[PDB]
Design a protein around this ligand. Structure first.
Ligand SMILES: O=S(=O)(O)c1cc(S(=O)(=O)O)c2c(/N=N/c3ccccc3)c(O)ccc2c1
Ligand SMILES: O=S(=O)(O)c1cc(S(=O)(=O)O)c2c(/N=N/c3ccccc3)c(O)ccc2c1
Ligand SMILES: O=S(=O)(O)c1cc(S(=O)(=O)O)c2c(/N=N/c3ccccc3)c(O)ccc2c1
Ligand SMILES: O=S(=O)(O)c1cc(S(=O)(=O)O)c2c(/N=N/c3ccccc3)c(O)ccc2c1
Ligand SMILES: [Zn+2]
Ligand SMILES: [Zn+2]
Ligand SMILES: [Zn+2]
Ligand SMILES: [Zn+2]
Ligand SMILES: [Zn+2]
Ligand SMILES: [Zn+2]
Ligand SMILES: [Zn+2]
Ligand SMILES: [Zn+2]
Ligand SMILES: [Zn+2]
Ligand SMILES: [Zn+2]
Ligand SMILES: [Zn+2]
Ligand SMILES: [Zn+2]
Lengths: 6, 6, 6, 6, 6, 6
């Protein structure tokens, strides 16, 4: 699982 | 699973 | 599963 | 976003 | 974001 | 973010 907030 | 907020 | 918000 | 594997 | 593996 | 492996 990868989660990214930019 | 990959989730990305840009 | 890939989810992308741009 | 909700993802569920059962 | 909620991810669940069961 | 909540991730759960069961
Ligand atoms: O957390 S980071 O900002 O460091 C970050 C951000 C991304 S990314 O913005 O999702 O691009 C990636 C990444 N991207 N993978 C996609 C490929 C195609 C579509 C969408 C995403 C990847 O392959 C490897 C590492 C990454 C690290
Ligand atoms: O999260 S990211 O912004 O880093 C991101 C965004 C996309 S994308 O905007 O969905 O293009 C992709 C991607 N695209 N795959 C499509 C191919 C045809 C139609 C629609 C989408 C891909 O093949 C690999 C990594 C990606 C990483
Ligand atoms: O991760 S859990 O297993 O704990 C899980 C699993 C589900 S569920 O299997 O998607 O049912 C739900 C859920 N369901 N929402 C639907 C309503 C109508 C159709 C499809 C789904 C809900 O409203 C609230 C919490 C949930 C927690
Ligand atoms: O890490 S724990 O195992 O302790 C765990 C596991 C879950 S759960 O399996 O995702 O059910 C939950 C939870 N569930 N939330 C859903 C609601 C509807 C659908 C899917 C999920 C919740 O509302 C609060 C705390 C939880 C703690
Ligand atoms: Zn990046
Ligand atoms: Zn930003
Ligand atoms: Zn990117
Ligand atoms: Zn932005
Ligand atoms: Zn992209
Ligand atoms: Zn935008
Ligand atoms: Zn459930
Ligand atoms: Zn099962
Ligand atoms: Zn549960
Ligand atoms: Zn199981
Ligand atoms: Zn639980
Ligand atoms: Zn188990």
């Amino acid at each position: 699982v990868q989660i990214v907030y930019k």
